[PDB]
Structure 1
Amino acid sequence: PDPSKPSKRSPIEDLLFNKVTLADAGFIKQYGDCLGDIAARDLICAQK
């Protein structure tokens, strides 16, 4: 762990998360240019 990277992640671990691209379930909350938050837990995930 590198206590300068988020959480108890090593320099390698940092690359292991940052180099995998997630744009699947739970990262899409709103769809079709609808209004409302697309962040935190402040609005209901309704993926599409």
Structure 2
Amino acid sequence: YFGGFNFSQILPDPSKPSKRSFIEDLLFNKVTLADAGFIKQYGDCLGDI
């Protein structure tokens, strides 16, 4: 209770494993990443799919 102001859309929600808010989820899903090799990808490159 913050005097009638609700910050529920900008405060984090602990249900999902990444503690991220609703607006931050919208901002993350809106920008389509290049899916670069910040996580390792030589296993995906060696396996010819």
Fold-level match, TM-score > 0.5? no
- Identify which of structures 1 and 2 has the higher relative contact order when contacts are C-alpha pairs closer than 8 Å and 6+ apart: 1
Structure having the higher Rg: 2
TM-score interval, smaller chain: 0.3 to 0.5
Q: What is the TM-score when the length of structure 1 is the normalising length? A: 0.43
Q: Which has the higher helix share?
A: 2
Q: What is the TM-score when the length of structure 2 is the normalising length? A: 0.43
